[PDB]
């Protein structure tokens, strides 16, 4: 991962109040982060942080603020027994005095029916009223929230029970949170039935309508001041006495450290339908954080191991696209795919997942081997039997078990690496350096062999079938083909965000990216296609293209190169690429370019694979002619003379053959035009 600080700001101080970001509420789009800091409604923007409005309407410190769930107003509840309501233009419209100091605020999604829990009542503020539609509950209403439909208002009471009520304050549910009262509940603005009953004891209660949990009630390592659902309930932003915010999967399994702050995050709230979170601290420091989720993935050209749910990996075997995740239940760092092995860097250790089926079509992985120690690496390399750690300079050799058999502190910064393909305990580390030099290190080879000093830095390389053609895509996004037989730049072309070779054909390299898919098919010239993204695999005619979040499968035809093969009388090479697999029109082209040119040996094989026995008979007749002299104008004349056009058959029977054939044959074919 990375959790980039979107912004972070110490709030301004005025009216001599304690600078604490008491509550955090969002405009429903997430633009204005509305932080009630001290006795102010310090209205910021959740992309920049600039103080759009300092709203000093309260007398005492504002204990709580809440934006309208339909997005029209944001109020402010303090200890001064009143609530001052500010519109979306941040202007004070209503100030209605309750009978007790405000504990928490919540707005209706249907209307601007603010609920204002006091110490003894709940001040239901209708969108334009001055009255306090109180909720006289015997227990103190410690938490309120409105369900996203706009009908139910859960009045969490100071008795260990969340008493869910209506817009009139009638007790309906007796949610059994336990002995701890729940000051922090929140209906997710997309979930009307998931109540995040976060308490002081550490229990992460994701409670339902009547008082049953959704996931496991996780006991946090810190007392949480606020717990909220990131990404609409898939991830969890927990914030408490840990001074920061953590990311947890909705199971309750750790993902990353979201925030890096100074004091108590009193309120945490994800920016709605965003990657950001409202991290406002006890010092008032409000900060969004870019919780950007990269699909970290390994790939043995078929099993796209993109990490999803961020403790699991949804590896899609792109041949079958079986998206059955691996239940690691712990944060995944780096992933790599072998023929059937899947090394996975967890917070536990290296977990090499191996499929139970010897094929790859099934998915349900099992951890056959694990490096026993907790071990992680930048570029994960799973071999048949080794988990090789690639660092920027070092190359810590490890097996599947965690034995540091070797270490290779390389000269330069490694920017790309892959496996050249080899027997167990012999797989390679074809290093693409930031210096651009390509070094070849295997599992048991203690020294690199410098193959190619590529001109620029290496981000995308590949090797051919014999591991001897190194097409290198630089950071400049162009393919630099280095035939290792030549050890030099034998080919170079643009329109190459990445290049991949073939496992059976030598100069079979495609390269997509920049909207152009130019494919130099073999020795014969380029093939034309359009594709963006990164090619990380080329199985002769197929691309598993990295479109920056996922693989996209786009085929490469050799049809232009097929025409180049056929029309240059190279129907032997065209026959070879027909064995690679092309259309039968190319097969007929092989048979006909061998037929009419009287190359009637290739014509037999190219016709017989189509099972055209009559053409085989024509080819055999004129081939037996061409194997016995009888000058081939006579035999080409026979080619068209058993086909059906007799002007050229007779005109080649002018000097080698007989045209009285035409006199006695045009009669019994009623083709009397050429008879005349």
């Amino acid at each position: 991962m990375r959790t980039v600080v979107a912004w972070q700001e110490t709030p301004p101080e005025k009216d001599g109040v304690r600078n604490v970001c008491y509550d955090l509420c969002f405009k429903p789009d997430g633009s204005q982060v509305v932080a009630g800091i001290g006795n102010r409604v310090l209205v910021y923007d959740a992309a920049d942080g600039d103080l759009l409005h300092a709203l000093k309407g309260h007398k005492d410190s504002i204990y709580c603020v809440a934006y309208a769930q339909n997005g029209k107003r944001f109020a402010s509840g303090g200890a001064d027994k009143t609530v001052i309501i500010w519109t979306s233009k941040a202007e004070g419209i209503l100030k209605y005095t309750h009978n007790d100091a405000i504990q928490c605020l919540s707005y209706n999604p249907v209307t601007q029916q603010l609920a204002s829990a006091t110490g003894s009542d709940v001040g239901l503020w209708s969108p334009e009223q001055k009255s306090v539609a109180k909720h006289k509950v015997a227990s103190r209403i410690c938490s309120i929230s409105w369900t996203a439909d706009g009908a139910y208002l859960a009045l969490g009471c100071f008795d260990g029970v969340i008493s869910i009520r209506d817009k009139g304050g009638s007790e309906k549910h007796r949610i059994e949170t336990g002995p701890s009262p729940v000051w922090s509940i929140c209906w997710n603005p997309v979930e009307t039935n998931v109540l995040c009953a976060g308490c002081f004891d550490g229990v992460l209660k994701f409670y339902m309508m009547s008082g049953q949990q959704k996931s496991k009630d996780r006991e946090l390592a810190f007392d949480p001041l606020c717990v909220s659902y990131f990404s609409s309930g898939e991830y969890i932003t927990v914030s408490g006495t840990d001074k920061t915010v953590h990311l947890y999967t909705r199971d309750g399994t750790y993902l990353t450290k979201i925030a890096d702050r100074d004091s108590w995050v009193w309120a945490v709230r994800p920016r709605p339908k965003h990657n950001f979170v409202a991290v406002g601290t006890e010092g008032g420091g409000i900060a969004m954080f870019q919780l950007i989720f990269s699909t970290v993935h390994g790939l043995y050209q078929d099993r796209y191991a993109y990490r999803d749910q961020m403790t699991d990996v949804i590896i899609q075997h792109l041949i079958t696209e079986q998206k059955v995740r691996i239940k690691c239940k712990d944060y995944v760092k780096k992933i790599a795919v072998y023929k059937d092995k899947l090394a996975v860097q967890l917070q536990n250790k290296v977990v090499i997942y191996e499929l139970a089926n010897a094929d790859d079509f099934d998915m349900h992985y099992q951890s056959a081997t694990k490096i026993q120690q907790k071990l992680d690496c930048n570029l994960l390399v799973v071999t048949s039997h080794h988990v090789i750690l690639c660092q920027e300079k070092k190359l810590q050799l490890y097996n599947f078990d965690g034995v540091k058999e070797r270490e290779w502190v390389l000269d330069s910064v490694i920017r790309y690496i892959k496996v050249v393909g080899g027997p167990p305990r012999r797989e390679g580390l074809l290093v693409g350096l930031k210096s651009g030099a390509i070094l070849k290190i295997f599992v048991d080879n203690p020294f690199p062999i410098p193959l190619i000093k590529h001109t620029a830095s290496v981000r995308c390389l590949d090797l051919s079938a014999s591991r001897n053609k190194l097409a290198v895509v630089d950071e400049n996004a162009k393919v630099l083909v280095y035939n290792l037989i030549t050890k030099e730049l034998v080919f170079e072309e643009s329109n190459a965000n990445s290049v991949a070779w073939n496992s059976e054909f030598e100069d079979m390299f495609c390269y997509s990216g920049n909207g152009m898919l130019s494919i130099k098919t073999g020795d014969f010239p380029l093939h034309q296609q359009k594709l963006q993204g990164f090619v990380v695999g080329f199985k002769g005619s197929k691309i598993f293209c990295l479109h920056y979040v996922s693989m996209q499968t786009i085929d490469v035809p050799q049809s232009a190169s097929m025409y180049r093969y056929l029309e240059r009388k190279d129907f032997e090479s065209a026959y070879r690429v027909a064995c690679l697999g092309v259309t039968e029109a190319d097969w007929k082209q092989l048979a006909l370019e061998a037929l009419q040119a009287l190359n009637l040996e290739v014509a037999r094989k190219a016709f017989i694979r189509i099972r055209d026995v009559r053409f085989v008979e024509l080819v055999n007749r004129t081939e037996a002619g061409r194997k016995a002299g009888t000058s081939e104008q006579l035999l080409l004349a026979e080619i068209m003379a058993f086909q059906g056009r007799y002007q050229e058959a007779a005109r080649l029977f002018t000097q080698a053959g007989a045209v009285d054939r035409a006199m006695e044959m045009f009669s019994d074919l009623r083709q009397f035009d050429e008879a005349k």
Binding site: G421, G422, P423, P446, S466, E504, R614, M665
Partner: protein, 975 residues
Amino acid sequence: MFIYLSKKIAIPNNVKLRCISWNTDQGWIACGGESGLLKVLRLDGTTSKDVKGKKEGGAPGGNLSLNQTLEGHNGAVICVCWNNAFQKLTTSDEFGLIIVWMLHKGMWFEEMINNRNKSVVKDMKWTSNGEKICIVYEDGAVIVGSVDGNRLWGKELGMDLALVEWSPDGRLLLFATPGGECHVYDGNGNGVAKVPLYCNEGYAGASKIIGVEWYDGVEGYAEPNCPVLAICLDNGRMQLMRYESDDNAVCIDTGIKPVKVKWNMNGTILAVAGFQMSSAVADGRELWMVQFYNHNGEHLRTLRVPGGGISGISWEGNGLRLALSVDSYVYFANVRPDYKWGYFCNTLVYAFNRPDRSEHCVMFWDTKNNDKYPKYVRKLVAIQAFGDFCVLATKGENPGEHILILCNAIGSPVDSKYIEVEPKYLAITNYHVIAANDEVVYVWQFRTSFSKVLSTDINAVKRKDVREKMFSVDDSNPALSDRSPESFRNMTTQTTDPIACVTACDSVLMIGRASGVVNRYSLPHLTLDAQHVLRCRPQMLALNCNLSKMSIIDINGVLTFFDLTAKAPGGGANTMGEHLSFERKDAWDMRWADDNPELFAMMEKTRMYIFRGLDPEEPVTSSAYLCSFHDLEITAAFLDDIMQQPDQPDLEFMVMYETRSLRDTRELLKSASVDDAYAFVDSNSHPRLWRNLAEHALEQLDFTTADKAFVRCADYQGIQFVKHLGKLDDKAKQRAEVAVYFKRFDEAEQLYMRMDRPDLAIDMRMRLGDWFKVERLIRESSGDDAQLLNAHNKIGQYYSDRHKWGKAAQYYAQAKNSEMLVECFYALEDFVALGRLMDALPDGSPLLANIGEKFQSVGLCNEGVTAFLKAGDTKRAIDCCVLLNQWDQAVQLAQAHNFPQIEQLLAKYANHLLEKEKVMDAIELYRKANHSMEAARLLQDLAKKCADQKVHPLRVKKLYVLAALEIEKFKKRTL
């Protein structure tokens, strides 16, 4: 796209039907008659697959199988709604009696009785499934009844309510006032919003809402987010909504006085029905007619019904039929729905939509061997397929720009132009693709008339995209000089008339416009050959084989011809061509003959007439969209059935219709030897029938009838076969040799092991297929053993080319190929099998040096060395020996085969192992003698050295423990 009045069912009692609605579940349509009549007609689901069994005189439809009178209501049944899940037929009168009808023992009988009965239940509907029912009385009493129709909540909105309709989600109902407004209120009774009035926009005055119909989503939309809600008015301007708050509501200037509106059950076609004060007559005849628009709302069709009154319309589940609430009968009218399709090179293209994706699945499915190609191409508008190529009317990655995707028979893109011309009127030839805007006609000449033929010089064709021209529908000669395609985009004034449809052939263009004034263009001169004028506004144009008589079918769907030879009657050259006197009743598409100029395989309503002239041949009914009429023979594509099988299409739909010309001709050819046969070939021409007679009498061995039938037409190999079978030895061998000539491996095998040649049918099965059983055919009998061992190798290397190296490996066990077995176990990381294939390959050959170089390419230390040495590659053996840090063995073998790079590389990789944190290796690699006593002596001497140093105690203790353990073992063996 056409509708015709197919069948009217004789309704008992001849009751005016107040509103109609089709039973979307069982087809048991209950027409809602007035005075409480709910007569349940029964038609089953009839598609074009019925026409597959209804050739030569069929139509998709049923008959009066059942019509059950129902006794549940007393007033006129203004409310008839169908439960789309439970078959809860539920209706109400104008007084409020609500009854759910169960299909009780096959009859519709009462189950539920809901009653409030205080005002008029004027409109009432089931949901998308039929779980909630909107019983709304005239006083605004919205009784939303459940599946058992109980009063869940009855709230009077304080206003008169006449039209209500369930939304597809069924929460915010459409409480439409009779005055011309539609309101939205929730179940709580709070005011929420109001429906926009684009029907009332463009027409002054709040015109009365005639009916609020929303396609509830029974079978999904045609395309997603298409307008399926029609709040229509009697004014003549009505709006099409995706949702009840649509601000892009298409105000169609229908200009009529309708009463009803009903979408189809797949969301493709808008249908608006009602009467009209007929401006054609002074009396204003109450002509009830049904308009037809798309989901968006473009003018599709028009229904002409002379009935007394159509107070309701309803569609079939797939929209193939439209039922009508005509005063006399229930008029059932068959509908051809809108599909983007094409046919070319026996590949039926069709842009259906799967019910899990929104992209146009341009199904480039071959009909030659049932080869499936679901090309998913974005932003597709239309499909035109003709010749060797098919072009797809697609936009770019953005709207406005368009791509003319030239597709081959499989459908892969091979040529494409990013053009601003939208190919609405698209025509494709073998050298050109005619995109066409409203005036901007863009022939995309992708290949000249002289192109991909010789290419003898590098300047074969110097203009790839200048042969193309974005010329006009009004241009007269864009080849006086050489012109760029972008020469035309506008005039100094407006164009005279936009285009209607464009069809063309390889060196001709015919641009059928709405006023009929066709500018016909040549190729590649792209000059105006002849400015034609069509006398009717065409909906489609189809050209003949000789293009003399071409067909013009107009927007009302009546076939008119066009003989292209006539002069302008205006003093100029504005009009070419003239309508040949041929008109047929409701004829909607054409398949012109490719053999006889006078023949054509026309579409009438469902019946497919043929005319050898303007006189009828057999009316060989083909609701299938035809492919080719040629050699008195007709090819079909049952696209509606291939809408039902779009991911699993088949050749069963590609039937072969015929004329009675071909039928009786080839019938007496095959029956009568020469008696009726010979002259009747020339009677019904196109001597394909001479081949029919000739190879028929060749197969039946009439070496005079076949001989003289090959005399009258062109065939040498056939007359050679006549002389062959006239002299070929055995009759079983005659038919078997004919079968092996004529690809009939089955019939050849049928006559092998019968005249006792097992090996020759062993050859027939031996050829083609997997080569395992072919290996058994090789070994069980020496037939085509060498060729099919070569084929074993061929699909072995094909499997090797497709990561199936193992099946390749048992192919090369079946065949003989060991270096390619090395490649088989080389990419599969099985180099132990490569060392096995040292000896399977001929040893002593540098193939073993090649595989040793592979072992070097993975870095194998000495097994690559012995692969070298088996080939005699001693230098590479020494290079690998001294390369990979086996310095004692490196010394030994490099002095064995005499290339001593031992010490330079020895010190170099000693320093490299020092760089690789391995100091001990760098020291011990100098032990070229390396005895155990010498090893202990070296370790102890180094221990003494670094002990005197006392620095770096790790080396000190390491040398201590190594030397002391070895000396300890020396003392254990000593004392």
